[PDB]
């Protein structure tokens, strides 16, 4: 959603997203995944947001 | 074999248009004539 | 830069002429870019070549101005031998004349008018013409048709001015006829509105008359 | 190995290694075969996937439940490869699909029937000529159907109302 | 007092930011959608955006019913 | 449309071979040459057959259909094929978009002609004003 | 007289505001007449807002069952409403502008508020209903107008609605066409909760000198490309939804008539049934005449261009 | 004479429909309030980028006639200047507008009071009592000329253009549609056909200009205008746009679809009329 979708990419971020279960994803990717499902598709945990960035 | 893309179907539809328009004009004339009658005016007044 | 090169040769033609001019015209027919040759023909030194002994190059230039590729084939004995660029330019000009009349050119017509045997080189000629901003359109290989949306024009022997005037007069007459038809439709709509208003006023007069009666 | 098979059975492209499965376990000799299966599954390489199954058969379907599930796994990946091919061509010969999938023609027909019955394929099958006719959906219809239903229903409604009132 | 003041300003910014977006959410869809609509992300600190909308349950305007989160009184 | 004569110069520049460490994917040069010539095919060709497309791309028709199939799947080309007839239908602007674009181009060219006559020939503008005042 | 509506009669407005006929009927106000100037200004503000909601005030007057609108103006929204409501320094500019209009002439007072719903249709949300209920308690003659800049582009015609709320506890009568509108899933819940707490006014214009000039000018100026295809109604969405609404209404009327045929002596049922059938017929007729006009323009222009000579 | 002769426009002026709309409303209300068409005075605001001036908005100003001269309440204008600051900061003052015919010896008096406020003000005058088909709006600039040894300020007409955003184009287009079709379907195709009639008039005017140019070239002018003539030939080649079987089939398809829809609408109107007639018929004679 940042190399194929947006072209300007100005004043942008696309950080990492760390959860309680210690998994890591792009902030953009997990936030969009939270639209339909909210269960951290690697497990059935509810995926609390414990950190952003590396 | 009628794809309804020929002018004949359009002409038939326009003939039905003329028939329906004449029918509606007759209906409006009858409605006016009914409006002329005494009982409807008596009920309205 | 074809127009700038065309103007420079026009300026040069005002001076030096003769065999150098004929060779210069041959260079024009070989240099890509020049798709209009009417400006060259208007030069007085071209008319000097008319009375001059040499006429093969003038008949060559005259054919590029108005004639097409099939005419050039018949005149292989009276015209100077062309180059690959000269032949391609004439074929592009011939396609312009063909695309000017009909907007959809079947591949059969293309293979016939341009002495075209291989269809693969026919596509190469077509794409080369389009890529040089000569013709605009799309190709239909399944139907073997060449759909041309836009194409450049050609010069006129001062005889097509009458046809242009006739076409413009026909367009003006058609526009005036459509304007008169629109005015008639507006008048008919106004008459229908007046009839509806007359019906409404008749109804209201009848209602008021009955109200006065009671 | 249980997690990898279950992850591939849910028809999800999610990679079940990520940070949870450390890192070196991907290159483990006992797990490298499973890693190659995941790589082929994500890349939808049926030819490479089946080659790995036959090459490491002593550690691929050796456990009975995987041997039970290997047929379903093959069915899913063949469906995914097929579903990624039906769209581009449209109206293609059936035997070409069989050669591409390296399976029998009858299996392709059965898989095509299942995909159509699952509404995944918006097309039909011509078994006489071994042809898979896919609808183009370029008609832009499904509105004339609604217009006709509205027309007929409300005209019957008007007729009934007039009959009852008169 | 540094961390107390540090948490004080970020929760204050957290509430200010969310009431600007102000949309109904099921349980997790907008709480992540509000973070991407800020200036410099990571400042939100989700640990406070969840317990202060849970602190909003005492009153109206997203009363945020405790168990089945869905009654987010979208009227103010 | 890129031919096979521009290949030599670009290949040498890349990395005395191909930019990376060789390409060997039919050369990334020719992979892009086929990819680009297929895009340029989409610009003009409404539809195309297998053999003629292969001759255009200087590749076997089996290679041409697969590459066109791959680009449709990835969305880099819009269109569809038909293996029974061996015809790839690249694009067709129905009947309404083509007519609308043609009429818009005609109107734009008319406006450009009017502007050119007004600018290059202000005497024409004066004559037009005189004519419209006379009538 | 085209310009008669522009005459302001202050005493007549005071007389109407003292009479308060709207207190006698919650369906009193039925029509909303909007001036060309007002419409243009509102639409421009909505589209400048882009995908963000903007709002403003409408200046105008009342005339019988009709509410009239003339003007509209932005209020300082520092930091995009960083405070409560889109007001901030509101009546600061408002009252100044108002005294300034009593000075330069404009004497029409506040008649309502407008709000924009970019890409999600014209209706009142829960927040909008609370806002309008408050406005119907203080400035009783108020109207909640909603615009849609994104649908203005999509459908082509400006998506605009005028609404008035019902007082707390009061129930609407059975009569209610309720045109169908596409509502996105993030808004549909709130829409459904509050959709019966208000009603829609009939929005109408009256031509005018403002219209005559504006229309003619911009029309010629940009319509040289008179084609714009010719049928922006080709998009199924609008037409399809309208036809679906018509079908639903007529089927409801039939179900009513079938149940009312058993009850002998219920005149009100016959009245509402006839009215609903008549409303359905006029809506269908307007859609039909719009399509006919589109076809007429298409046919004339296409015949002129293609084979004139 | 307050008009400069031989002076060409130095800056480009872009005007928006909102500015014209504001002027029309200001003139109408003042005419309604005080009988005759009283002259109105307002201000122009917008964005200026170097020599490119874009007038996007316009508000009204206060005018006080004392000693037979117009005195503009610049303090009111200054009070309103900060008023519009609170809403829009990107818009800057550009000039003032008024209504009337040719410039009078009162607008020069007004313009000089606007020239002391800002560096370069713009002057616009609208004619609400026009009779021609052209736009009665002209933009004039301030120029200093030495007349009889005295520096006299004059007005130079500017060749302004019409700037409009997609949104303004669509909104005003809907405004045109709301006049074409009346609220109760009044004057249905009156303004509709007149719109196409005016478009065809514009096209016919272009055609007649081209034809007159060709006829003049036949006798005089340039014997061969090159580009122009060749392109006009190719353009008539597009007059018979010309079609194939598929385009005619699709055109007849659309015509048949719209005709069927029209037939359905006529059926609906006829059945409504029938329902009304039956309702009356159950009343006049029938019981129950
Ligand atoms: Zn991203
Ligand atoms: Zn997890
Ligand atoms: Zn709202």
Curated annotation (Swiss-Prot), chain D:
It comes from the Eukaryota. Residues 1-139 form the PCI domain. It is found in: Cytoplasm; Nucleus. Phosphorylated by CK2 and PKD kinases. Essential component of the COP9 signalosome complex (CSN), a complex involved in various cellular and developmental processes. The CSN complex is an essential regulator of the ubiquitin (Ubl) conjugation pathway by mediating the deneddylation of the cullin subunits of SCF-type E3 ligase complexes, leading to decrease the Ubl ligase activity of SCF-type complexes such as SCF, CSA or DDB2. The complex is also involved in phosphorylation of p53/TP53, c-jun/JUN, IkappaBalpha/NFKBIA, ITPK1 and IRF8/ICSBP, possibly via its association with CK2 and PKD kinases. Belongs to the CSN2 family. Component of the CSN complex, composed of COPS1/GPS1, COPS2, COPS3, COPS4, COPS5, COPS6, COPS7 (COPS7A or COPS7B), COPS8 and COPS9 isoform 1. In the complex, it probably interacts directly with COPS1, COPS4, COPS5, COPS6 and COPS7 (COPS7A or COPS7B). Specifically interacts with the ligand binding domain of the thyroid receptor (TR). Does not require the presence of thyroid hormone for its interaction. Interacts with CUL1 and CUL2. Interacts with IRF8/ICSBP1 and with nuclear receptors NR2F1 and NR0B1. Interacts with NIF3L1. This is COP9 signalosome complex subunit 2. It comes from Homo sapiens.
From Swiss-Prot, chain E:
Brain, spermatozoa, and testis (at protein level). Widely expressed. There is a cross-link at residue 20 (Glycyl lysine isopeptide (Lys-Gly) (interchain with G-Cter in NEDD8)). Transmembrane segments: none annotated. It comes from the Eukaryota. Coiled coil: none annotated. Changing residue 27 to R: Found in a patient with autism spectrum disorder; uncertain significance. It is found in: Nucleus; Golgi apparatus; Cell projection, Cilium, Flagellum; Cytoplasm, Cytoskeleton, Spindle. Neddylated. Attachment of NEDD8 is required for the E3 ubiquitin-protein ligase activity of the BCR complex. Deneddylated via its interaction with the COP9 signalosome (CSN) complex. Residues 6-68 form the Cullin neddylation domain. Belongs to the cullin family. It is linked to Pseudohypoaldosteronism 2E: An autosomal dominant disorder characterized by severe hypertension, hyperkalemia, hyperchloremia, hyperchloremic metabolic acidosis, and correction of physiologic abnormalities by thiazide diuretics. Core component of multiple cullin-RING-based BCR (BTB-CUL3-RBX1) E3 ubiquitin-protein ligase complexes which mediate the ubiquitination and subsequent proteasomal degradation of target proteins. BCR complexes and ARIH1 collaborate in tandem to mediate ubiquitination of target proteins. As a scaffold protein may contribute to catalysis through positioning of the substrate and the ubiquitin-conjugating enzyme. This is Cullin-3. It comes from Homo sapiens. The chain holds residues 693 to 768 of 768 of the full protein.
From Swiss-Prot, chain F:
Signal peptide: none annotated. It comes from Homo sapiens (Human). Component of the CSN complex, composed of COPS1/GPS1, COPS2, COPS3, COPS4, COPS5, COPS6, COPS7 (COPS7A or COPS7B), COPS8 and COPS9 isoform 1. In the complex, it probably interacts directly with COPS1, COPS2, COPS3, COPS5, COPS6, COPS7 (COPS7A or COPS7B) and COPS8. Interacts with TOR1A; the interaction is direct and associates TOR1A and SNAPIN with the CSN complex. Interacts with STON2; controls STON2 neddylation levels. Interacts with ERCC6. This is COP9 signalosome complex subunit 4. It is found in: Cytoplasm; Nucleus; Cytoplasmic vesicle, Secretory vesicle, Synaptic vesicle. Component of the COP9 signalosome complex (CSN), a complex involved in various cellular and developmental processes. The CSN complex is an essential regulator of the ubiquitin (Ubl) conjugation pathway by mediating the deneddylation of the cullin subunits of SCF-type E3 ligase complexes, leading to decrease the Ubl ligase activity of SCF-type complexes such as SCF, CSA or DDB2. Also involved in the deneddylation of non-cullin subunits such as STON2. The chain holds residues 272 to 406 of 406 of the full protein. Coiled coil: none annotated. Belongs to the CSN4 family.
From Swiss-Prot, chain G:
One of its GO terms (molecular function) is metal ion binding. Keywords: Acetylation, Cytoplasm, Cytoplasmic vesicle, Hydrolase, Metal-binding, Metalloprotease, Nucleus, Protease, Signalosome, Synapse, Zinc. Its cofactor is a divalent metal cation. It is found in: Cytoplasm, Cytosol; Nucleus; Cytoplasm, Perinuclear region; Cytoplasmic vesicle, Secretory vesicle, Synaptic vesicle. GO terms for cellular component: chromatin; COP9 signalosome; cytoplasm; cytosol; eukaryotic translation initiation factor 3 complex; nucleoplasm; nucleus; perinuclear region of cytoplasm. Zn(2+) binds at residues 115, 117, 128. SMART domains: JAB_MPN. It is an enzyme of class 3 (hydrolase). A motif (JAMM motif) lies at residues 115-128. Residues 32-169 form the MPN domain. Its main location: cytoplasm. One of its GO terms (biological process) is positive regulation of DNA-binding transcription factor activity. The keyword Hydrolase applies. Pfam families: CSN5_C, JAB. InterPro entries: CSN5_C, JAMM/MPN+_dom, JAMM_MPN+_peptidase_M67A, MPN. Its EC number is 3.4.-.-. Probable protease subunit of the COP9 signalosome complex (CSN), a complex involved in various cellular and developmental processes. The CSN complex is an essential regulator of the ubiquitin (Ubl) conjugation pathway by mediating the deneddylation of the cullin subunits of the SCF-type E3 ligase complexes, leading to decrease the Ubl ligase activity of SCF-type complexes such as SCF, CSA or DDB2. The complex is also involved in phosphorylation of p53/TP53, c-jun/JUN, IkappaBalpha/NFKBIA, ITPK1 and IRF8, possibly via its association with CK2 and PKD kinases. Belongs to the peptidase M67A family. CSN5 subfamily.
């Amino acid at each position: 959603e940042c190399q194929a979708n947006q072209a300007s990419a100005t004043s942008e971020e696309c950080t990492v997203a760390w959860g309680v279960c210690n998994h890591a994803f792009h902030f953009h990717c997990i936030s969009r995944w939270l639209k339909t499902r909210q269960v951290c598709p690697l497990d059935n945990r509810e995926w609390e947001f414990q950190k952003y960035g590396h | 074999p009628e794809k309804y893309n020929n002018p004949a179907m359009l002409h038939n539809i326009d003939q039905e248009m003329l028939k329906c328009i004449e029918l509606d004009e007759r209906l409006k004339a009858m409605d006016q004539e009914i409006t002329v009658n005494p009982q409807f005016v008596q009920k309205s007044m | 830069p074809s127009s700038n090169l065309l103007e420079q040769f026009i300026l040069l033609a005002k001076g030096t002429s003769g065999s150098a001019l004929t060779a210069l015209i041959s260079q024009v027919l070989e240099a890509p870019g020049v798709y209009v040759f009417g400006e060259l023909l208007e030069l007085a030194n071209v008319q000097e070549l008319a009375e001059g002994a040499n006429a093969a190059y003038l008949q060559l230039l005259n054919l590029f101005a108005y004639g097409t590729y099939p005419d050039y084939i018949a005149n292989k004995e009276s015209l100077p031998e062309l180059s690959t660029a000269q032949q391609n330019k004439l074929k592009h000009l011939t396609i312009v004349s063909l695309a000017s009349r009909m907007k959809c050119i079947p591949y059969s017509v293309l293979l016939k008018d341009l002495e075209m045997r291989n269809l693969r080189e026919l596509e190469d000629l077509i794409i080369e013409a389009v890529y040089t901003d000569i013709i605009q359109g799309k190709l239909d290989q399944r139907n073997q048709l060449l759909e041309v949306d836009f194409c450049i024009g050609r010069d006129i022997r001062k005889k097509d001015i009458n046809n242009i005037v006739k076409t413009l007069h026909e367009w003006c007459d058609g526009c005036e006829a459509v304007l008169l038809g629109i005015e008639q439709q507006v008048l008919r709509a106004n008459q229908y509105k007046e009839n509806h208003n007359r019906t409404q006023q008749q109804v209201e007069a009848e209602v008021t008359n009955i109200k006065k009666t009671l | 190995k249980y997690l990898v098979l279950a992850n591939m059975l849910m028809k999800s492209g999610i990679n079940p290694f990520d940070s949870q499965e450390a890192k070196p376990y991907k290159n483990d000799p006992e797990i490298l075969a499973m890693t190659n299966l995941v790589s082929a599954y994500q890349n939808n390489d049926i030819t490479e996937f089946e080659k790995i199954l036959k090459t490491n058969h002593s550690n691929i379907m050796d456990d009975p439940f995987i041997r039970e599930h290997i047929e379903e796994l093959l069915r899913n990946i063949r469906t995914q490869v097929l579903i990624k091919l039906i769209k581009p061509y449209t109206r293609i010969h059936i035997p070409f699909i069989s050669k591409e999938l390296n399976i029998d023609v009858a299996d392709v027909e059965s898989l095509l029937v299942q995909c159509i019955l699952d509404n995944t394929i918006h097309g039909r099958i011509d078994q006489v000529n071994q042809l898979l006719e896919l609808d183009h959906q370029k008609r832009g219809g499904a509105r004339y159907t609604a217009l006709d239903k509205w027309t007929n229903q409300l005209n019957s409604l008007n007729q009934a109302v007039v009959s009852k009132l008169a | 007092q540094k961390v107390d003041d540090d948490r004080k300003h970020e929760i204050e910014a957290a509430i200010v930011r969310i009431m600007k977006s102000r949309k109904k959410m099921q349980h997790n869809v907008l709480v992540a959608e509000v973070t991407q609509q800020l200036k410099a992300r990571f400042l939100p600190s989700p640990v406070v955006i969840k317990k202060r909308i849970e602190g909003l349950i005492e009153r109206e305007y997203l009363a945020r019913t405790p168990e089945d989160r869905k009654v987010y009184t979208y009227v103010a | 449309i890129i031919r096979g004569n521009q290949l030599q110069e670009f290949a040498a520049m890349l990395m005395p071979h191909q930019k990376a460490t060789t390409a060997d994917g039919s050369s990334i040069l020719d992979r892009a040459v086929i990819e680009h010539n297929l895009l340029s095919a989409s610009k003009l060709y409404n539809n195309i057959t297998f053999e003629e497309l292969g001759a255009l791309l200087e590749i076997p028709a089996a290679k041409a259909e697969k590459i066109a199939s791959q680009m449709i799947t990835e969305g880099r080309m819009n269109g569809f094929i038909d293996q029974i007839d061996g015809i790839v239908h690249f694009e067709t602007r129905e009947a309404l978009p083509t007519w609308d674009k043609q009429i818009q181009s005609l109107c734009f060219q008319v406006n450009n002609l009017l502007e050119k006559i007004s600018q290059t020939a202000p005497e024409w503008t004066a004559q037009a004003m005189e004519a419209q005042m006379a009538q | 007289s085209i310009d008669e509506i522009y005459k302001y009669d202050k005493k007549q407005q005071q007389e109407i505001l003292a009479a308060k006929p709207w207190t006698k009927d919650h369906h009193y106000f039925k029509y909303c007449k909007i001036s060309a100037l007002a419409l243009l200004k509102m639409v421009m503000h909505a589209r400048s807002g882009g995908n963000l909601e903007v709002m403003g005030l409408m200046l105008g007057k009342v005339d019988g069952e009709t509410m009239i609108i003339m003007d509209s103006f932005a209020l300082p929204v520092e930091g995009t409403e960083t405070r409560v409501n889109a007001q901030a320094a509101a009546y600061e500019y408002m009252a100044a502008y108002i005294e300034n209009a009593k000075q330069v002439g404009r004497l029409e007072n506040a008649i309502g508020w407008y709000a924009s719903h970019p890409g999600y249709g014209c209706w009142l949300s829960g927040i909008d209903v609370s806002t309008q209920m408050l406005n119907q308690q203080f400035q009783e003659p108020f109207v909640a107008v909603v615009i849609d800049p994104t649908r203005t582009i999509s459908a082509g015609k400006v998506n605009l609605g005028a609404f008035r709320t019902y007082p707390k506890g009061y129930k609407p009568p059975d009569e209610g066409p309720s045109e169908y509108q596409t509502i996105p899933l993030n808004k549909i819940e709130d829409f459904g909760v509050h959709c019966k707490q208000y009603y829609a006014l009939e929005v109408s214009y009256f031509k005018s000198s403002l219209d005559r000039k504006l229309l003619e000018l911009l029309w010629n100026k940009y319509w040289v490309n008179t084609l714009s295809s010719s049928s922006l109604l080709t998009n199924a969405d609008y037409t399809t939804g309208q036809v679906f609404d018509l079908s639903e209404k007529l089927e409801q009327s039939e179900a009513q008539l079938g149940r009312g045929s058993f009850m002998l002596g219920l005149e009100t049922h016959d009245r509402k049934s006839e009215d609903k059938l008549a409303k359905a017929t006029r809506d269908s007729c307007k859609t039909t005449i719009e399509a006919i006009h589109g076809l007429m323009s298409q046919v004339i222009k296409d015949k002129l261009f293609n084979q004139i000579n | 004479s307050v008009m400069a002769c031989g002076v060409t426009g130095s800056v480009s002026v872009a005007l928006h429909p909102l500015v014209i709309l504001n002027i029309s409303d200001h003139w109408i209300r003042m005419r309604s309030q005080e009988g005759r068409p009283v002259q109105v005075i307002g201000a122009l605001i917008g964005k200026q980028e170097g020599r490119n001036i874009e007038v996007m908005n316009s508000f009204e100003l206060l005018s006080h006639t004392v000693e037979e001269k117009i005195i503009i309440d610049k303090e009111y204008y200054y009070t309103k200047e900060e008023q519009f600051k609170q809403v829009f900061k990107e818009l800057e003052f550009l000039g003032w507008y008024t209504t009337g015919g040719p410039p009078d010896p009162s607008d020069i008096h007004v313009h000089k009071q606007v020239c002391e406020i800002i560096e370069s003000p713009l002057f616009l005058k609208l004619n609400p009592m026009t009779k021609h088909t052209d736009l009665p709006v002209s933009v004039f600039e301030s120029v200093i000329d030495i007349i009889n040894g005295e520096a006299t300020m004059l007005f130079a007409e500017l060749t302004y253009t019409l700037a409009t955003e997609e949104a303004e184009r669509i909104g005003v287009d809907h405004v045109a549609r709301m006049t074409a079709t009346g609220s109760g379907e009044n004057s249905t195709v009156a303004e509709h056909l007149i719109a196409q009639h005016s478009a065809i008039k514009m096209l016919h005017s272009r055609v007649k200009l081209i034809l007159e140019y060709v006829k003049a070239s036949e006798a005089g002018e340039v014997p061969f205008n090159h580009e122009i003539l060749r392109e006009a030939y190719a353009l008539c080649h597009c007059l018979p746009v010309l079609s194939t079987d598929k385009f005619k089939t699709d055109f007849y398809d659309q015509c048949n679809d719209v005709g069927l829809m029209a037939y359905l609408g006529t059926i609906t109107k006829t059945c409504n009329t029938m329902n009304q007639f039956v309702n009356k018929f159950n009343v006049l004679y029938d019981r129950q």
